[PDB]
Amino acid sequence: SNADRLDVAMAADDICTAITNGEQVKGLYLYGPFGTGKSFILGAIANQLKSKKVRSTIIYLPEFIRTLKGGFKDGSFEKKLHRVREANILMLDDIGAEEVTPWVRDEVIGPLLHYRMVHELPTFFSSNFDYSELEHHLAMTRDGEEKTKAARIIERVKSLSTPYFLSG
Amino acid sequence: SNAMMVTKEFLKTKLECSDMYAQKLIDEAQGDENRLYDLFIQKLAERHTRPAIVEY
Ligand SMILES: Nc1ncnc2c1ncn2[C@@H]1O[C@H](COP(=O)(O)OP(=O)(O)O)[C@@H](O)[C@H]1O
Ligand code: BEF
Ligand SMILES: [Mg+2]
């Protein structure tokens, strides 16, 4: 895992340096067991960029989804929510840990990911799941339509990211 | 119908998570109850502490 850590460290270094130099980059999909420092590294990237006057946003997906599911009106969340899809640099922290809610998955997340895919907006992820596992998590049921929707999501995630494993 | 099923539904209920995520927690604990409980509380704390969106 020192090797894992080294690989991810130079990935993050390269990505921050490129972003700061105004280059096109692809985000990281960081995955692995609990507590290996995935969220920490996403935070380190955000703070590194901040140090260079580059903006970025980190969504904590469980609470994002909980807020959307529960409903909201006019506060900080609504104001921030309206910026997320077109944020210059976006990170989805702990995808896989949220409650799966089809309308949120398909009306908010899917379109968001499609947008960032086609406009090549850097998008990062952390998860306890690899892409295959995440695709299965995203399907609320065995139903065909669910399988198709989940597949759409995961292909967009794959187009947007390069996967890195951080070991126990 | 057995302790494992119970533990899984308990995690799904209290963390409000998917079956697969709950099973990931269980697998990670590898049969150690205290380890699973500690992990549960770590994630419970994160869930109730973190804002949905943080802008940098
Ligand atoms: N490189 C690191 N240096 C110093 N503290 C760290 C580092 N990585 C993690 N910590 C801490 O270790 C704990 C677990 O890291 P975290 O990023 O939450 O794990 P996860 O991979 O599950 O997202 C956190 O308290 C986090 O702040
Ligand atoms: F517990 Be972590 F966010 F994988
Ligand atoms: Mg994390």
GROMACS .gro file of C-alpha atoms in nm, chain A residues 60 62-63 66, chain B residues 41-54:
model
   18
   60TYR     CA    1  -2.038   1.422   0.044
   62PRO     CA    2  -2.477   1.038   0.150
   63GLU     CA    3  -2.580   1.378   0.291
   66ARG     CA    4  -3.037   1.267   0.207
  209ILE     CA    5  -1.985   0.434   1.475
  210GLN     CA    6  -1.705   0.588   1.261
  211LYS     CA    7  -1.938   0.600   0.962
  212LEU     CA    8  -2.236   0.704   1.175
  213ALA     CA    9  -2.028   0.995   1.299
  214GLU     CA   10  -1.921   1.094   0.950
  215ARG     CA   11  -2.277   1.081   0.824
  216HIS     CA   12  -2.404   1.313   1.097
  217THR     CA   13  -2.112   1.552   1.088
  218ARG     CA   14  -2.038   1.630   0.723
  219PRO     CA   15  -2.218   1.899   0.519
  220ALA     CA   16  -2.357   1.782   0.182
  221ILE     CA   17  -2.156   2.033  -0.021
  222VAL     CA   18  -1.827   2.206   0.055
   0.00000   0.00000   0.00000
